[PDB]
Design a protein around this motif. Sequence first.
Motif, PDB file in Angstrom:
ATOM      1  N   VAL A  58       0.852  -1.222  -0.020  1.00 41.14           N
ATOM      2  CA  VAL A  58       0.311  -0.198   0.035  1.00 41.14           C
ATOM      3  C   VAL A  58       0.675   1.301  -0.023  1.00 41.14           C
ATOM      4  O   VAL A  58       1.648   1.479   1.036  1.00 41.14           O
ATOM      5  N   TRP A  70      -7.423  -0.599  -2.114  1.00 40.39           N
ATOM      6  CA  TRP A  70      -5.960  -1.441  -2.571  1.00 40.39           C
ATOM      7  C   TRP A  70      -6.301  -2.938  -2.688  1.00 40.39           C
ATOM      8  O   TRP A  70      -6.404  -3.420  -1.446  1.00 40.39           O
ATOM      9  N   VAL A  86      -4.417   0.094  -6.500  1.00 43.41           N
ATOM     10  CA  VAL A  86      -5.843   0.485  -6.099  1.00 43.41           C
ATOM     11  C   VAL A  86      -6.847  -0.089  -7.312  1.00 43.41           C
ATOM     12  O   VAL A  86      -6.466  -0.033  -8.530  1.00 43.41           O
TER      13      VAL A  86
END
Length: 132
Positions: free
Chosen positions: A83, A109, A113
């Motif tokens: 992330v 995500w 994403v």
Amino acid sequence: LEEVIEQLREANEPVPVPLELPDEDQLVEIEEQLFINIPFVFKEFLLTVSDVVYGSLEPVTVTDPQSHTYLPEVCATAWDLGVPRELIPICQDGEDYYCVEEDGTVLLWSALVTEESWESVWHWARDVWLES
Ligand SMILES: [Ca+2]
Ligand SMILES: [Ca+2]
């Protein structure tokens, strides 16, 4: 806003050890620990409903460092998993993460994403959390 908060508070499910709601000082501590600024609306969410238990999702919290939803630990896990550091997780969902942009947009995500997003943490709370 008052509407959504009430909906969550009144839907709160009893648990053995009730979750605690943080105060502004506690949130500042978390921000400093992660060297990040928590978006205003996200901060509002944490200060008003992070003690709520509901549905099949357990959003992040900041009052119990031993919890699996403890924000600093969730961030470390999510950022190490891929992330973007600029995104702050608001809720883990398996290996995926609902995260918040600096301007407040909530994204999902995927363990990149996806194409789906929510205008604010409150849209996410109303349309995702309360719908779980
Ligand atoms: Ca923007
Ligand atoms: Ca945005």
